[PDB]
């Protein structure tokens, strides 16, 4: 290094883990994105929603890696586990799986902020705030909104509701 200052080995390690988490989340969204582009699923707006998220999670991993280098920490990459599912069911199933995924990332961010606080590392605490914490809260709110609307559309005709939600809410 030569630059490292007030940056604990504990935070460095947690940041590398959080990179793996974000990359895993990107991979999961990549899978979701292609599943909804299958000719037997064919929900364009849902596919684009998840493809967009795959890109956001990748960008989050890259921002963490840049920060790791800015602090004099060292990136360490691990094997990326495949997503939990090969097929993702309905839009409802997928949005449920998405909120749980996001909740898990948010909790990892909270655990890291807690560690930053315990380690008296305010640069970390700020970094997470501006790039990650508020973004997660806004995203989880949106998914909750979507889940509520998906659920109101289930009714007795599930196909009709799945079509209308994709057409009228997720418009490409």
CB of 80 to a copy of itself, least distance (A): 4
- Contact between 13 and a copy of itself by CB under 8 A: the answer reads no
Among a copy of itself, Pd ion, none, what binds residue 75 when CB lies within 5 to 8 Å by partner kind?
a copy of itself
84 is an interface residue for a copy of itself by CB under 8 A = no
- Provide, rounded to whole angstroms, the least separation between the CB of residue 167 and Pd ion: 10
**Interface with Pd ion (CB under 5 A), residue from 44, 97, 139, 147:** 44
Q: 136 near 102, Cβ under 8 Å? A: yes
Query: Counting contacts by CB under 8 A, is residue 118 touching a copy of itself?
Result: no
b or e along 47-64 (b: 16 or more beta carbons within 10 Å of the residue's beta carbon)? Answer: bbbbbebbeebbebbeeb
170 binds Pd ion (CB under 5 A): no
Q: How far is the CB of 34 from a copy of itself (least distance, A)?
A: 5
Among 21, 29, 31, 53, binds a copy of itself (CB under 8 A): 31
What is the widest separation between alpha-carbon atoms in the chain?
Answer: 65
134 contacts which partner out of a copy of itself, Pd ion, none, CB within 5 to 8 A by kind?
Answer: a copy of itself
In the bound complex, what is the minimum distance in angstroms from residue 30's beta carbon to Pd ion?
A: 15
Distance, CA of 98 to CA of 155 (rounded, Å)? 22
Tell me: does residue 52 bind a copy of itself (CB under 8 A): no
Residue 49 found at the interface with a copy of itself (CB under 8 A): no
Which residues participate in the annotated binding site for Fe cation? 52, 55-56, 59, 62
Residues making contact with Pd ion (CB under 5 A): 44
Q: From the annotation, which residues make up the binding site?
A: 52, 55-56, 59, 62
């Amino acid at each position: 290094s030569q630059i490292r200052q007030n940056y604990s080995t504990e935070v460095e390690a947690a940041v590398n883990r959080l990179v793996n988490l974000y990359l895993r989340a990107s991979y999961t969204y990549l899978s979701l994105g292609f599943y909804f582009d299958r000719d037997d699923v064919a929900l364009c707006g849902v596919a684009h929603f998840f493809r967009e998220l795959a890109e956001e999670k990748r960008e989050g991993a890259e921002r963490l890696l840049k920060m790791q280098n800015q602090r004099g920490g060292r990136a360490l990459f691990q094997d990326l586990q495949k997503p939990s599912q090969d097929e993702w069911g309905t839009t409802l199933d997928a949005m449920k799986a998405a909120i749980v995924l996001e909740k898990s990332l948010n909790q990892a961010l909270l655990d890291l902020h807690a560690l930053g606080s315990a380690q008296a590392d305010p640069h970390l605490c700020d970094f997470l705030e501006s790039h990650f914490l508020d973004e997660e809260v806004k995203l989880i709110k949106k998914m909750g909104d979507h889940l509520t609307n998906i659920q109101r559309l289930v009714g007795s005709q599930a196909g009709l509701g799945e079509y209308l939600f994709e057409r009228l809410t997720l418009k490409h």
